[PDB]
Amino acid sequence: SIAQARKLVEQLKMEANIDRIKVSKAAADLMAYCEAHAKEDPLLTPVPASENPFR
Amino acid sequence: DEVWVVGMGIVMSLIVLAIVFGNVLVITAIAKFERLQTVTNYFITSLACADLVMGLAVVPFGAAHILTKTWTFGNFWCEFWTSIDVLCVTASIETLCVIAVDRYFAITSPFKYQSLLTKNKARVIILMVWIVSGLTSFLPIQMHWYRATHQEAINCYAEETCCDFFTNQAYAIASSIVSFYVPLVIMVFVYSRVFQEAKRQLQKIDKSEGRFHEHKALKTLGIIMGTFTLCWLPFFIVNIVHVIQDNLIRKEVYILLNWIGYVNSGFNPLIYCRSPDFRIAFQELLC
Amino acid sequence: EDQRNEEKAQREANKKIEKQLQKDKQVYRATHRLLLLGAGESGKSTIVKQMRIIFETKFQVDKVNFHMFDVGGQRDERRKWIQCFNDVTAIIFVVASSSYNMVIDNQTNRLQEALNLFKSIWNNRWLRTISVILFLNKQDLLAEKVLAGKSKIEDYFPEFARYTTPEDATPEPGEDPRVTRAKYFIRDEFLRISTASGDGRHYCYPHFTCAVDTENIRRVFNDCRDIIQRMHLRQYELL
Amino acid sequence: ELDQLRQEAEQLKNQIRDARKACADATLSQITNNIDPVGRIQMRTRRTLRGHLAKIYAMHWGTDSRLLVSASQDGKLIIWDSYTTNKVHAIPLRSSWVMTCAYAPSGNYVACGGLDNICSIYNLKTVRVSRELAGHTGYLSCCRFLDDNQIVTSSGDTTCALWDIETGQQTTTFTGHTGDVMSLSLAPDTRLFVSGACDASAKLWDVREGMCRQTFTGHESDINAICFFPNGNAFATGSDDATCRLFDLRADQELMTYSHDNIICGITSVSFSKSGRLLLAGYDDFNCNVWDALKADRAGVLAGHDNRVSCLGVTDDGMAVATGSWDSFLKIWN
Numbered sequence: 001s002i003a004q005a006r007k008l009v010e011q012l013k014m015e016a017n018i019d020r021i022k023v024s025k026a027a028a029d030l031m032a033y034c035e036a037h038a039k040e041d042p043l044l045t046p047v048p049a050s051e052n053p054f055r
Numbered sequence: 056d057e058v059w060v061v062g063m064g065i066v067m068s069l070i071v072l073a074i075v076f077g078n079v080l081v082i083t084a085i086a087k088f089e090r091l092q093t094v095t096n097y098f099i100t101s102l103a104c105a106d107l108v109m110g111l112a113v114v115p116f117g118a119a120h121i122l123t124k125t126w127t128f129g130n131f132w133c134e135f136w137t138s139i140d141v142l143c144v145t146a147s148i149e150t151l152c153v154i155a156v157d158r159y160f161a162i163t164s165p166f167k168y169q170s171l172l173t174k175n176k177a178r179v180i181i182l183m184v185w186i187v188s189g190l191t192s193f194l195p196i197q198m199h200w201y202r203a204t205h206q207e208a209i210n211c212y213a214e215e216t217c218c219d220f221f222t223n224q225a226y227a228i229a230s231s232i233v234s235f236y237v238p239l240v241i242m243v244f245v246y247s248r249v250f251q252e253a254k255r256q257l258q259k260i261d262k263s264e265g266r267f268h269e270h271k272a273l274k275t276l277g278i279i280m281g282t283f284t285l286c287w288l289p290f291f292i293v294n295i296v297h298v299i300q301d302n303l304i305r306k307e308v309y310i311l312l313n314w315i316g317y318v319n320s321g322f323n324p325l326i327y328c329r330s331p332d333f334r335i336a337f338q339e340l341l342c
Numbered sequence: 343e344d345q346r347n348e349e350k351a352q353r354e355a356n357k358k359i360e361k362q363l364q365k366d367k368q369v370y371r372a373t374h375r376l377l378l379l380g381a382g383e384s385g386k387s388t389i390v391k392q393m394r395i396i397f398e399t400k401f402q403v404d405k406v407n408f409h410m411f412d413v414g415g416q417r418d419e420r421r422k423w424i425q426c427f428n429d430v431t432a433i434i435f436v437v438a439s440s441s442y443n444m445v446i447d448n449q450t451n452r453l454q455e456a457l458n459l460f461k462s463i464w465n466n467r468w469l470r471t472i473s474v475i476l477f478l479n480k481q482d483l484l485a486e487k488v489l490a491g492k493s494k495i496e497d498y499f500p501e502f503a504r505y506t507t508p509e510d511a512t513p514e515p516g517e518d519p520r521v522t523r524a525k526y527f528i529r530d531e532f533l534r535i536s537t538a539s540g541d542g543r544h545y546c547y548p549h550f551t552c553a554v555d556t557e558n559i560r561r562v563f564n565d566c567r568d569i570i571q572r573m574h575l576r577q578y579e580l581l
Numbered sequence: 582e583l584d585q586l587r588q589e590a591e592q593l594k595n596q597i598r599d600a601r602k603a604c605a606d607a608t609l610s611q612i613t614n615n616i617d618p619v620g621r622i623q624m625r626t627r628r629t630l631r632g633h634l635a636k637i638y639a640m641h642w643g644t645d646s647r648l649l650v651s652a653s654q655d656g657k658l659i660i661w662d663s664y665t666t667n668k669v670h671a672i673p674l675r676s677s678w679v680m681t682c683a684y685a686p687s688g689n690y691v692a693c694g695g696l697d698n699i700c701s702i703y704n705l706k707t708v709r710v711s712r713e714l715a716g717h718t719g720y721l722s723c724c725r726f727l728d729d730n731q732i733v734t735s736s737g738d739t740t741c742a743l744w745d746i747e748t749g750q751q752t753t754t755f756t757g758h759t760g761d762v763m764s765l766s767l768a769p770d771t772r773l774f775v776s777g778a779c780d781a782s783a784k785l786w787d788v789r790e791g792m793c794r795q796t797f798t799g800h801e802s803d804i805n806a807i808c809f810f811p812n813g814n815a816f817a818t819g820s821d822d823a824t825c826r827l828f829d830l831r832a833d834q835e836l837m838t839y840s841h842d843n844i845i846c847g848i849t850s851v852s853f854s855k856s857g858r859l860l861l862a863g864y865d866d867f868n869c870n871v872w873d874a875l876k877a878d879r880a881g882v883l884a885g886h887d888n889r890v891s892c893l894g895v896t897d898d899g900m901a902v903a904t905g906s907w908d909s910f911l912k913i914w915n
């Protein structure tokens with residue numbers, strides 16, 4: 001009732017006060033993380049048949 | 056004369072190609088995909104295999120024999136070819152009878168169909184059909200029980216260049232009864248019962264909800280029965296007619312009706328493989 | 343050495359697991375599954391009761407195993423768990439026929455809500471090949487309301503004025519024409535929705551049921567047999 | 582008054598929208614344009630698992646990247662062995678309707694749930710039931726082992742809970758959603774987790790505090806699947822409008838959407854790779870598509886299933902991907 005609007009209204013505040021960063025830094029961090037482990041994942045680069053346990 | 060040879064040859068090659076291609080495609084489609092491997096499709100697989108064997112074995116050699124008008128192989132190969140022809144012809148019909156019986160069981164007994172037919176019993180049924188088909192083809196031909204007794208038959212049998220069919224009354228009757236007449240009444244009765252089922256179901260639906268809203272059954276039953284009957288009926292009549300009394304049926308008519316019987320090979324994929332899933336399978340590969 | 347020993351250990355257990363499944367596959371394939379679903383106050387518990395003399399039930403008719411489900415734990419207008427019930431043999435729908443004037447908090451006639459629920463169920467994407475067995479429960483209260491009743495159906499359903507009794511109707515003996523007209527109007531009110539978008543892949547089997555009745559268990563058996571027979575006939579291109 | 586309460590709500594939303602719009606410096610496509618695409622990717626089936634009598638809804642790869650579990654409506658849990666394609670365990674179930682399963686990180690416990698509002702765990706190495714958790718008022722959608730003593734579940738009553746196996750009593754409850762909750766995913770450090778509801782929203786929770794932290798409302802239909810980026814600052818969701826969106830925790834708005842004009846189906850599962858470059862998602866078109874995380878360009882198709890795909894998982898070492906479908910078969914792609 002009046003109370004339920006009160007809870008949503010109080011919570012909406014908490015979310016508004018959070019600090020944020022620019023999109024460019026977030027994209028750069030994802031690019032760096034993807035570039036760091038490029039050789040790690042076998043899915044991108046097919047593995048030799050010697051080290052493949054499913055063959 | 057030369058024109059006849061050129062024309063007859065073109066027809067034989069086209070028939071062979073059409074017979075082989077459809078059966079090979081059906082077998083490949085059934086074997087490749089795991090969604091089409093059911094109990095019903097095993098009978099179709101056996102029928103396709105038998106039809107492919109027949110169309111790959113007995114048609115080219117018969118065409119060579121009628122065109123060259125001289126059998127240039129040994130008597131052993133003549134007997135083997137006759138045995139293979141009889142085996143394939145008598146095994147390409149009992150499979151249709153089994154399919155009809157399976158449809159009868161599926162339609163008239165819906166609650167117990169799952170328990171009645173299992174993958175373990177279909178193999179036994181197919182093996183029994185093949186054994187009973189081969190028991191009447193190689194046994195009385197490799198052994199000389201079908202061999203005739205009159206003078207013309209003996210004269211051709213002594214020679215090593217003529218390979219014709221001469222048989223006694225007992226074999227000519229027993230083989231026909233085993234191959235054609237026995238598997239016909241069963242199909243007729245089964246399809247009559249199926250038609251009655253369909254008619255009563257349609258009548259029930261029309262009575263239930265007609266005010267808001269049997270051509271289909273007959274177009275299907277008519278096609279299925281008529282193709283087989285028109286393909287294989289006259290030959291299995293003249294087979295007994297020309298034996299019950301001599302000098303009634305000429306050799307040319309007999310051979311022509313026998314070759315008309317062979318044409319049934321190219322129609323089985325067109326009749327028993329018209330389901331939409333089969334069309335999708337045919338579109339998936341070689342398309 | 344050890345590799346032979348481990349394989350003889352592991353392979354043996356698979357064979358055992360395979361054998362148990364074959365024993366279970368037959369009993370799984372033998373049974374037929376049903377779903378019970380109805381509106382509130384319809385009569386569902388009572389229909390299940392005389393049959394006896396999440397909730398699951400075992401009942402066997404003529405050496406055939408049946409299995410019926412009644413879901414009541416989740417009560418919501420939006421139904422998303424329905425995706426799991428696309429392999430059942432049939433759906434049993436129970437609706438209160440006599441509650442054409444109650445109001446459910448203000449809301450449409452209770453029948454109108456049941457009609458909307460049936461329309462939503464029929465046109466669902468995942469239930470395109472599932473038949474429905476329809477039960478019109480509370481057959482005596484409807485007759486009591488129709489005979490010497492102050493309330494009239496024309497007040498709630500305007501279309502009743504231009505509706506005439508079907509020529510093929512076969513009413514039970516002793517019943518007045520008025521109750522027959524009301525009953526058949528209610529029946530075709532569902533039949534229209536059933537027929538509009540059926541597409542020939544699934545049908546409806548309306549029925550009339552009261553409190554003092556003991557033939558529902560045979561009706562379900564006959565309807566399931568008809569459903570399976572029709573499916574098999576359609577599969578081979580014979581219907 | 583009550584009118585003011587609406588008024589107060591009206592601006593806070595406007596302030597949040599304005600802040601998110603101002604924070605948008607440049608689009609993802611601009612920054613990632615220069616890098617070369619990975620090219621076409623082709624994968625072939627390596628193993629095929631059979632033995633389930635009905636359609637499959639759930640699975641979970643083991644921590645050893647060797648064993649896995651699956652659930653079906655037959656009422657049976659089967660623990661396979663990928664290397665030797667032979668079964669190990671088969672657990673009968675009290676109820677035949679299940680929608681989820683999980684595998685403990687220590688490899689000792691297995692959990693499952695369904696239409697019955699009970700989460701049941703099993704003791705593999707003692708196979709008998711050990712505990713039954715009750716208290717929910719709706720069907721369960723997902724459950725993930727946070728540890729060997731506490732588990733987190735999501736149900737259909739618009740709530741989530743953090744249980745305690747030893748005592749069998751709820752510790753913390755999470756509220757704030759409107760529609761049904763369908764999926765969740767945990768952080769690598771098991772400190773935060775997200776959830777996707779049926780009201781087209783995804784929320785980020787705090788495990789210890791038990792209070793919501795952020796809210797995202799980018800979608801327009803039901804949300805069925807949710808994954809989590811390996812870096813720990815991003816996640817991806819899949820919805821019924823055939824659109825996948827990559828959000829970000831720090832920025833607090835979506836960055837890139839994955840869609841194609843020739844698909845109008847739904848999405849049932851979403852997963853990442855070890856490096857996070859490939860985003861795999863299962864559809865209702867009986868096949869799986871593979872995307873590129875930074876470019877939104879298709880790079881392959883995972884076809885071979887005869888029915889819709891309802892499961893997806895990638896091993897811990899990223900050696901293979903396994904898919905489950907309604908055709909009662911499991912496949913291992915490599």
Ligand SMILES: Nc1nc2c(ncn2[C@@H]2O[C@H](COP(=O)(O)OP(=O)(O)OP(=O)(O)O)[C@@H](O)[C@H]2O)c(=O)[nH]1
Pocket residue numbers: 380381382383384385386387388389479480481482483551552553554
């Ligand atoms: N006259 C009559 N009354 C019935 C009948 N079935 C149910 N009722 C009435 O409804 C009561 C049964 O409970 P209902 O309110 O129908 O609820 P339910 O059977 O549990 O079904 P749900 O509400 O769908 O769960 C009876 O005590 C009657 O008052 C019926 O066949 N005839």
Ligand SMILES: CN[C@@H]1CCc2c(ccc(O)c2O)[C@H]1O
Pocket residue numbers: 140141144145220227230231234313
């Ligand atoms: C030469 N072709 C043969 C000759 C006799 C014969 C055939 C088929 C089935 C039989 O039972 C037969 O007795 C024909 O195909």
